[PDB]
Tab-separated table of C-alpha atoms and ligand atoms in Angstrom:
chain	number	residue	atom	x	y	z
A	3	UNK	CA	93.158	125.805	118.704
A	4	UNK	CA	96.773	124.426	119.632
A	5	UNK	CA	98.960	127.137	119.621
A	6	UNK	CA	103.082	126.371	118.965
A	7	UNK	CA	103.857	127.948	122.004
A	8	UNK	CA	101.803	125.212	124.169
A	9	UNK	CA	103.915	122.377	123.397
A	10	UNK	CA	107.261	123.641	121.371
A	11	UNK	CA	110.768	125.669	123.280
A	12	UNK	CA	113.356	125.947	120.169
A	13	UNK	CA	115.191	127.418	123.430
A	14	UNK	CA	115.540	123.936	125.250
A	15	UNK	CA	117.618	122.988	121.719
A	16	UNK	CA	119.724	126.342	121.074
A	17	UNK	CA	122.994	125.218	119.327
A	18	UNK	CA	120.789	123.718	116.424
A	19	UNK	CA	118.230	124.675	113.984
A	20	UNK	CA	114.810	125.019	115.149
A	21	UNK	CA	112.791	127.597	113.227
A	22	UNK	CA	112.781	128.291	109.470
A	23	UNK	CA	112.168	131.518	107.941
A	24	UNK	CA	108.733	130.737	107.458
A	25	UNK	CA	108.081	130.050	111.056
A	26	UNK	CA	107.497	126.287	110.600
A	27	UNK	CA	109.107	124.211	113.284
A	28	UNK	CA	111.989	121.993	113.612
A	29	UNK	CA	111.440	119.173	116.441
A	30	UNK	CA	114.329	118.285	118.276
A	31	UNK	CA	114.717	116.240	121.132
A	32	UNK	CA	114.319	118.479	124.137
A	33	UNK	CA	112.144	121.378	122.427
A	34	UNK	CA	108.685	119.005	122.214
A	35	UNK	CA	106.015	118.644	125.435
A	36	UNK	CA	104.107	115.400	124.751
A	37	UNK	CA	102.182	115.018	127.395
A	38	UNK	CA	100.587	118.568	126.564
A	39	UNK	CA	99.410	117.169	122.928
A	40	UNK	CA	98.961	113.616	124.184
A	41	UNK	CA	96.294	115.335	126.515
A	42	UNK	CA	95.486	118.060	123.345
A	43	UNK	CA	94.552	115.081	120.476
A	44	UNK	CA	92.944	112.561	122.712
A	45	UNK	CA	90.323	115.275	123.165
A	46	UNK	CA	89.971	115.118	119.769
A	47	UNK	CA	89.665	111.330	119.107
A	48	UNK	CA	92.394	111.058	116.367
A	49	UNK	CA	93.345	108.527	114.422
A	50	UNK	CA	97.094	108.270	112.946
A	51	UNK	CA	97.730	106.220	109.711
A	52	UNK	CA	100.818	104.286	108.413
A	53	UNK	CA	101.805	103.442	105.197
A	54	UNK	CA	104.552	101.081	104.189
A	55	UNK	CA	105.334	99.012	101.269
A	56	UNK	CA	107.612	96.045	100.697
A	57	UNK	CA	107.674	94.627	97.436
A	58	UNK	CA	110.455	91.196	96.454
A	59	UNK	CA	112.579	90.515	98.785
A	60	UNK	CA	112.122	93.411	100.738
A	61	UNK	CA	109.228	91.832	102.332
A	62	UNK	CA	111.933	88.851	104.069
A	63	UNK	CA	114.257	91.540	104.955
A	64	UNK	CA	112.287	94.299	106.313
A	65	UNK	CA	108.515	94.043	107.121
A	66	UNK	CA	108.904	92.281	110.335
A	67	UNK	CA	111.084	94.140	112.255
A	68	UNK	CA	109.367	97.901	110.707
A	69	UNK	CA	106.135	96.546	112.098
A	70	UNK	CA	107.421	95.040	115.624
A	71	UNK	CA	109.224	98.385	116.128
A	72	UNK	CA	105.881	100.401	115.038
A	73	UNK	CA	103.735	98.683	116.942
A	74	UNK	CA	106.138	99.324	120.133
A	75	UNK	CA	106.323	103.401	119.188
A	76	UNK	CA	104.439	104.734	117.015
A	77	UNK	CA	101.921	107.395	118.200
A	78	UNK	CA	101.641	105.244	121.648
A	79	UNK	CA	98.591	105.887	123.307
A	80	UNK	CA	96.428	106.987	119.918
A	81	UNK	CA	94.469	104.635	117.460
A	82	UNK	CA	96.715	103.872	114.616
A	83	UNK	CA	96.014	101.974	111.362
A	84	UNK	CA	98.962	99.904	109.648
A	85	UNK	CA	98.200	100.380	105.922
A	86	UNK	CA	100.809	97.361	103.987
A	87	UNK	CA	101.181	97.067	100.973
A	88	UNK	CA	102.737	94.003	99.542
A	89	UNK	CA	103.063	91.948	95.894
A	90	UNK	CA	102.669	88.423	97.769
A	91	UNK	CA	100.227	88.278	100.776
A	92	UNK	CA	101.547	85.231	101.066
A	93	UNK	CA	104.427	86.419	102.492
A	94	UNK	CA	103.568	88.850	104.502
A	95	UNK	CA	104.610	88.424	108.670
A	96	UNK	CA	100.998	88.298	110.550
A	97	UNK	CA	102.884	89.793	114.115
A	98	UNK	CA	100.891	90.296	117.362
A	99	UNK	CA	99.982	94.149	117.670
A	100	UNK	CA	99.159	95.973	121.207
A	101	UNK	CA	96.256	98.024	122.233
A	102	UNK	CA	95.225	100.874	120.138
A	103	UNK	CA	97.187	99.002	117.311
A	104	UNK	CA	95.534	97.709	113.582
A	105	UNK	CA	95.921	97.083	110.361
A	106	UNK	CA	94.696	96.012	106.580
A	107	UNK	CA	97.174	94.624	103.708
A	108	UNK	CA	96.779	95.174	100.178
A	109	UNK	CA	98.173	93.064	97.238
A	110	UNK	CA	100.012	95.521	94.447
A	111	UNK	CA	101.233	94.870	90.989
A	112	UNK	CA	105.174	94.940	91.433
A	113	UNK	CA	106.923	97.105	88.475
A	114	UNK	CA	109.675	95.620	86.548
A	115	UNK	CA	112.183	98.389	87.568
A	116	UNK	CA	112.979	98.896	91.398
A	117	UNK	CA	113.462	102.646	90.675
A	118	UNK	CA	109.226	102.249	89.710
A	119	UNK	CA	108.326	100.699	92.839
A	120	UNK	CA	109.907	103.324	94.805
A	121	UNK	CA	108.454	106.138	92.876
A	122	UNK	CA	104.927	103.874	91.782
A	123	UNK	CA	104.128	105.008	95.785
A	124	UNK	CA	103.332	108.188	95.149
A	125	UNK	CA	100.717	107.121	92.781
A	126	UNK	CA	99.022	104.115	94.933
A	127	UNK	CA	99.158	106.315	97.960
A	128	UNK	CA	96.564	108.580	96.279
A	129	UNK	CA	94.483	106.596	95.387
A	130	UNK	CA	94.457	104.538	98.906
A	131	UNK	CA	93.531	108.461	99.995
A	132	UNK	CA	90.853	108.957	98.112
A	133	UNK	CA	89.278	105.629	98.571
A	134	UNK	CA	89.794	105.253	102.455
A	135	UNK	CA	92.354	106.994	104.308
A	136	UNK	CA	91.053	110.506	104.400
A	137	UNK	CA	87.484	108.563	105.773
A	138	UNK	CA	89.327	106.583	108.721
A	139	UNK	CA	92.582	109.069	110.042
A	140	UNK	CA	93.131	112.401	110.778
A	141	UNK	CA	97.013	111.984	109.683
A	142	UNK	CA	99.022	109.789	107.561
A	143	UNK	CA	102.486	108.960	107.521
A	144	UNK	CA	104.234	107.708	104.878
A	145	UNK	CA	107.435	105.500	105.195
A	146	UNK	CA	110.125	103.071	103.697
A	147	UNK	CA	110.346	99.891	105.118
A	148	UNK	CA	114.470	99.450	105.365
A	149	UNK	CA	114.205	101.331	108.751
A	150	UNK	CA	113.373	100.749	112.312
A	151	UNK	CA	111.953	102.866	115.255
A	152	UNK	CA	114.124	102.775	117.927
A	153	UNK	CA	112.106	105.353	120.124
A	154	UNK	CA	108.862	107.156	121.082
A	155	UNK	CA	107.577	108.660	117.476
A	156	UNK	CA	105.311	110.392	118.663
A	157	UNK	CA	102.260	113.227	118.299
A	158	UNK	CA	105.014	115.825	118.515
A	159	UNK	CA	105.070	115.067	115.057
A	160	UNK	CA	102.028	115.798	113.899
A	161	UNK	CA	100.880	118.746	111.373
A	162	UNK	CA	99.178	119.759	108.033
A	163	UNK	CA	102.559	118.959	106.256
A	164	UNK	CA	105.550	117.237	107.706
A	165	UNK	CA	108.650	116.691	106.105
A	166	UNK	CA	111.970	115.028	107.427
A	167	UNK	CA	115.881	116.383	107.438
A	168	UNK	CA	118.087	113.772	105.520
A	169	UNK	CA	120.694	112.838	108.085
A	170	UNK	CA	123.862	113.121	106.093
A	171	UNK	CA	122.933	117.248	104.599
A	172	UNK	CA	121.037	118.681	107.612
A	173	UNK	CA	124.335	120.741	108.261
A	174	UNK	CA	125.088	121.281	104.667
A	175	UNK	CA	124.724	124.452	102.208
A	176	UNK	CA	122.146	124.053	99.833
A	177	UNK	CA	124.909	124.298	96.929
A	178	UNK	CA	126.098	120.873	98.288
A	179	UNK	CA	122.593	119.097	97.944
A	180	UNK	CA	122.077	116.349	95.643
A	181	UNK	CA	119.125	117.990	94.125
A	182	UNK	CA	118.001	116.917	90.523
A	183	UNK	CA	120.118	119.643	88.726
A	184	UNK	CA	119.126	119.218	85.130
A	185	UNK	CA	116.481	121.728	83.809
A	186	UNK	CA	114.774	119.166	81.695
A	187	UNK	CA	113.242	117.418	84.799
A	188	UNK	CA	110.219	118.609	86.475
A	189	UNK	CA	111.923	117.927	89.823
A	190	UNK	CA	114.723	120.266	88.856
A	191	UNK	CA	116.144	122.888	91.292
A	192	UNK	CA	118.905	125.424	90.515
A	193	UNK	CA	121.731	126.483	92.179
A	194	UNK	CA	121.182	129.291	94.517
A	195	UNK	CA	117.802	127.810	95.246
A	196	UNK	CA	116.530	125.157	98.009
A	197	UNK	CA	116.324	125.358	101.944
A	198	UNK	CA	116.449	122.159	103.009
A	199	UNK	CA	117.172	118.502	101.695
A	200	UNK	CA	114.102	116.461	103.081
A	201	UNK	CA	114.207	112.488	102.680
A	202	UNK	CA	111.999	110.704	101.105
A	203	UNK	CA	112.204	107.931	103.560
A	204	UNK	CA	109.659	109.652	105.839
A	205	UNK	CA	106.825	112.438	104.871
A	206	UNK	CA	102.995	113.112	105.984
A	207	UNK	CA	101.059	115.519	107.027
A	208	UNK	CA	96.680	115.498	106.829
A	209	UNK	CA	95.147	112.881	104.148
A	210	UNK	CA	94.409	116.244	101.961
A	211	UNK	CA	97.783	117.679	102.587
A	212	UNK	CA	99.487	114.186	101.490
A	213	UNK	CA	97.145	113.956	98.693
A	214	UNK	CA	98.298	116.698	97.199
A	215	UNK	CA	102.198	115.835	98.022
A	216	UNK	CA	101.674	112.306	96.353
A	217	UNK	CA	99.874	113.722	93.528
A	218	UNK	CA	101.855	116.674	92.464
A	219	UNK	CA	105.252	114.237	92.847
A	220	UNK	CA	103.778	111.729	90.720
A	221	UNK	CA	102.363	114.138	87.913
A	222	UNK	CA	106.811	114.963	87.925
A	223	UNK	CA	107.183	111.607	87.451
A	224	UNK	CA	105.491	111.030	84.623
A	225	UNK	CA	105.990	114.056	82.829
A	226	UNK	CA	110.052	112.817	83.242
A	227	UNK	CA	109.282	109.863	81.489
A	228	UNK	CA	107.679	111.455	78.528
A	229	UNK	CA	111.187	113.660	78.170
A	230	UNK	CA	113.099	110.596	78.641
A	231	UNK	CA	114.917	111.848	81.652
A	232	UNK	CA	115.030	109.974	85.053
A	233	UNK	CA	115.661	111.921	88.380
A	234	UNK	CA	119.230	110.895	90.059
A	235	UNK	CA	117.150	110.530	93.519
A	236	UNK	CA	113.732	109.298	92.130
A	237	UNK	CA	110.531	109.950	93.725
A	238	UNK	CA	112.840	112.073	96.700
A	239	UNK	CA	114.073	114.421	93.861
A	240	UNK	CA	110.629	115.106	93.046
A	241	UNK	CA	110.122	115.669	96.958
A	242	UNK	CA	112.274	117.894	97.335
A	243	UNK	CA	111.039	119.851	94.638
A	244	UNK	CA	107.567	119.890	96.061
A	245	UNK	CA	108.781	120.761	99.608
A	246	UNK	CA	110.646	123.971	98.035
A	247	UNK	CA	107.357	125.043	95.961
A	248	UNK	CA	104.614	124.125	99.014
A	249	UNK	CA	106.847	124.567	102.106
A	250	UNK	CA	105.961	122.347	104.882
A	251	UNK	CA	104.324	122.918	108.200
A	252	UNK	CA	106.569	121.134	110.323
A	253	UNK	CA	109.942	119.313	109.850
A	254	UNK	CA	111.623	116.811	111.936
A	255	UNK	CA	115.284	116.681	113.194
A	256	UNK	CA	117.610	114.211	111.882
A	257	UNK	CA	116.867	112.351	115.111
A	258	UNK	CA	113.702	110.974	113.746
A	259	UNK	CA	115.649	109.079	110.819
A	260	UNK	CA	118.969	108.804	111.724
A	261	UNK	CA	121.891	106.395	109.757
A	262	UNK	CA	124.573	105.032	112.658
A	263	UNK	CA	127.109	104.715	109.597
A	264	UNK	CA	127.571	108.226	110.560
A	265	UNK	CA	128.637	107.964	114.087
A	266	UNK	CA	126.463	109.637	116.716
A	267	UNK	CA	127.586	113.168	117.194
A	268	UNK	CA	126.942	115.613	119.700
A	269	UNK	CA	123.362	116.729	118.199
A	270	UNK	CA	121.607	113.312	118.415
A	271	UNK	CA	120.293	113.401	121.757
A	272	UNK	CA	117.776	110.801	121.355
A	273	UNK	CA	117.374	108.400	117.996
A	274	UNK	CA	113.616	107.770	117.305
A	275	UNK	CA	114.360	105.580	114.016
A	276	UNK	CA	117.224	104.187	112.116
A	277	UNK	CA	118.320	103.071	109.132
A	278	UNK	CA	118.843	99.847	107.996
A	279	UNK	CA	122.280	98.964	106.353
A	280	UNK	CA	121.777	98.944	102.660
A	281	UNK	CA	121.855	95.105	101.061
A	282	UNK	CA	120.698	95.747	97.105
A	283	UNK	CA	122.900	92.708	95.964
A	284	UNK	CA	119.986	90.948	97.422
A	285	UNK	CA	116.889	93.169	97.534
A	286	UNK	CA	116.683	94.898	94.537
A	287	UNK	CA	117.022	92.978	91.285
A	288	UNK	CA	117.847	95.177	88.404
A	289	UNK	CA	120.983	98.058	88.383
B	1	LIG	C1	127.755	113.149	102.464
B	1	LIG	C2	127.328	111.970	101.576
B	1	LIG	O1	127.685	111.854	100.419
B	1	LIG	N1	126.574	111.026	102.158
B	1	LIG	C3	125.997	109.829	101.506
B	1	LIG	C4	124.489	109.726	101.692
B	1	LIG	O2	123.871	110.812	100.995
B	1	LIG	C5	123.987	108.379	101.185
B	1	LIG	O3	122.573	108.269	101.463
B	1	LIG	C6	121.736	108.243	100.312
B	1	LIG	O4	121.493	109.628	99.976
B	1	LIG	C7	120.624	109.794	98.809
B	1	LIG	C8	120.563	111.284	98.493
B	1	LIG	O5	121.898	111.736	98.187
B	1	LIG	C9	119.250	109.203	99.191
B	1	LIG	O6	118.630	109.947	100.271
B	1	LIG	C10	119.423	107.720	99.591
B	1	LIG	O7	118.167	107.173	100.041
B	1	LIG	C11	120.438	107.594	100.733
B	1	LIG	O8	120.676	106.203	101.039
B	1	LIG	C12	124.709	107.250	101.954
B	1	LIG	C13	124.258	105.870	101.466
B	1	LIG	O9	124.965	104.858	102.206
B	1	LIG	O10	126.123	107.388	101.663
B	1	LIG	C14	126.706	108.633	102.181
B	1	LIG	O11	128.086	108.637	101.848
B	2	LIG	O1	112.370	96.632	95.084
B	2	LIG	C1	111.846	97.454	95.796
B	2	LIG	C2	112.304	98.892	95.821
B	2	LIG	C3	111.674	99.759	96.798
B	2	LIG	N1	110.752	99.251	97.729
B	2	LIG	C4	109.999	100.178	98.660
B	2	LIG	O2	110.392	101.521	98.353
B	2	LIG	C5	111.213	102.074	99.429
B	2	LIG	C6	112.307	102.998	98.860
B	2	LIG	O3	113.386	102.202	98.300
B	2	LIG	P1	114.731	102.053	99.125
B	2	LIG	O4	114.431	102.065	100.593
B	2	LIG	O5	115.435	100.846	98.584
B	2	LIG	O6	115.546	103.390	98.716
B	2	LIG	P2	116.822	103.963	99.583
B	2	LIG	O7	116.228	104.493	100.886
B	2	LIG	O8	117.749	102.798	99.815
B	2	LIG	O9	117.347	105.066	98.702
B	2	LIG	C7	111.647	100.844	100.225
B	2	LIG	O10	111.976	101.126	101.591
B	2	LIG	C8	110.449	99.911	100.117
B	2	LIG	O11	109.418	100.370	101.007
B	2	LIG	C9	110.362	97.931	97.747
B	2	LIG	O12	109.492	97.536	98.535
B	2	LIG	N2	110.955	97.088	96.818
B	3	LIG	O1	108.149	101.444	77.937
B	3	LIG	C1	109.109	102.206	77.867
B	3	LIG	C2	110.285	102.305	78.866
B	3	LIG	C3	110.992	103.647	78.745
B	3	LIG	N1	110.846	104.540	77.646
B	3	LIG	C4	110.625	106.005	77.967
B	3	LIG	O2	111.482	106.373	79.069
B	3	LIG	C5	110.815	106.050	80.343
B	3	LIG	C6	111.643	104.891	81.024
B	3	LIG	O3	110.743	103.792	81.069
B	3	LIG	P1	110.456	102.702	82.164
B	3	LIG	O4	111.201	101.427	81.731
B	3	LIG	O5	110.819	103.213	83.510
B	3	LIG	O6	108.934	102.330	81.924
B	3	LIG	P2	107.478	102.799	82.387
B	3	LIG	O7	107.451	103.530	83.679
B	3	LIG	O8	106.863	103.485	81.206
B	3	LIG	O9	106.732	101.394	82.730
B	3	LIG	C7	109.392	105.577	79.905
B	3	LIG	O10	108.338	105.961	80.811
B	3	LIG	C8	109.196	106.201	78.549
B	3	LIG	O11	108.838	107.565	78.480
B	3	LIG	C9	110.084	104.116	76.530
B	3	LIG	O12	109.812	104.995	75.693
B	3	LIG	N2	109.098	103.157	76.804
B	4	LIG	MN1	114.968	103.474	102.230
């Protein structure tokens, strides 16, 4: 079996973190040897899978340029399956993919709210997994559309449970995160709790591992509404929650989802995604 030592040196990346304190990895730039699991899971024969919704305008906005950009980096050199889901397939931009590139589209019910489409995911995602995904991929991703990769996103990233460093709190105390911090929420977590505060803009992991992610958040979710209480962050609050319970198997750097409203400091050595500038005068249609 692969071992960590085969393809990961948390020595090539020393000024940042790359282990947590349950021995799960941190991929940086610099600490990853593709080539080794390129030659690793094409022995295998894996397949990679990619969901993405865009629901409203969303779909003008953002669908285009997340799939050119996936096509282009995503997993090159592997089978991968583009798994859209839209409210109007009439909309929806039919792009040219490259080799080792396809995909399938679904039409979905848009919710009223744009705080329920967000967090409706977690639901539809489960189901997709039960009917199809965990029969045609060996691992899933899972990913907002208002973002584009920039770089090789590779098999580096691969594992039984992947979860991804927001980029404005990967150098923050846990104190500081905007966790869901009322008691009466399912995805609450108290001070003087939490390791990490993982986005919700990127998570996956094997179709049974994201099952159970997708699940578990979306039993939160509901449970919320029957208290009449909303998490501040949504379907990521309930992420987070999950994340701290089930701890996950590997995590990416802030490099893998980065926002250039930041800057780009010292410790962003290579930018495999970014994040498109927020527009929700247009996009979204309720406060
Ligand atoms: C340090 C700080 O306040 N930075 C904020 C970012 O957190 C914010 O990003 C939003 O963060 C929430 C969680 O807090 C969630 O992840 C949202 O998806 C994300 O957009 C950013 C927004 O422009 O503003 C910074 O000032
Ligand atoms: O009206 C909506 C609201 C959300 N989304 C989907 O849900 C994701 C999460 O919402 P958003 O990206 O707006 O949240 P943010 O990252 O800005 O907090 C989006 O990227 C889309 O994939 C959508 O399609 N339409
Ligand atoms: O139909 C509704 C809308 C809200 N609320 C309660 O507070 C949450 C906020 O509701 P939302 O508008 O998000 O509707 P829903 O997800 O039920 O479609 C609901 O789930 C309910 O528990 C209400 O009692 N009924
Ligand atoms: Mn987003």
């Amino acid at each position: 079996k692969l071992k960590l030592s085969d393809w990961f040196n948390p020595f090539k990346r020393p000024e940042v973190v790359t282990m947590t304190k349950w021995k799960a990895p941190v991929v940086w730039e610099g600490t990853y040897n593709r080539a080794v699991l390129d030659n690793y899971y094409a022995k295998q024969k894996i397949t990679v899978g990619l969901t993405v919704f865009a629901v409203g305008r969303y779909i003008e906005h953002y669908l285009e340029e997340f799939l050119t950009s996936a096509n282009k980096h995503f997993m090159v050199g592997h089978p991968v399956i583009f798994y859209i889901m839209v409210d109007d397939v009439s909309r929806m931009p039919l792009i040219e993919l490259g080799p080792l590139r396809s995909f399938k589209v679904f039409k979905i019910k848009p919710e009223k709210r744009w705080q329920d489409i967000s967090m409706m995911r977690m639901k539809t995602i489960g189901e997709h997994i039960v009917a199809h995904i965990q029969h045609e991929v060996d691992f899933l991703f899972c990913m907002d559309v208002d973002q584009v990769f920039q770089d090789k996103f590779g098999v580096e990233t691969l594992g039984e449970s992947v979860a991804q460093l927001q980029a404005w709190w990967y150098k923050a105390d846990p104190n500081d995160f905007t966790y869901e911090r009322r008691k009466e929420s399912a995805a609450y977590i108290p001070f003087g709790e939490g390791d990490f505060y993982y986005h919700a803009a990127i998570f996956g992991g094997t179709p049974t591992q994201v099952l159970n992610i997708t699940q578990e958040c979306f039993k939160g979710i509901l449970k919320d509404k029957k208290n009449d209480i909303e998490a501040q962050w949504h379907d990521e609050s309930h992420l987070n929650k999950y994340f701290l319970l089930n701890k996950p198997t590997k995590i990416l750097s802030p490099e893998y989802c980065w926002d250039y409203h930041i800057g780009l400091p010292a410790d962003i050595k290579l930018v495999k995604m970014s994040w498109q500038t927020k527009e929700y005068n247009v996009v979204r249609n309720n406060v």
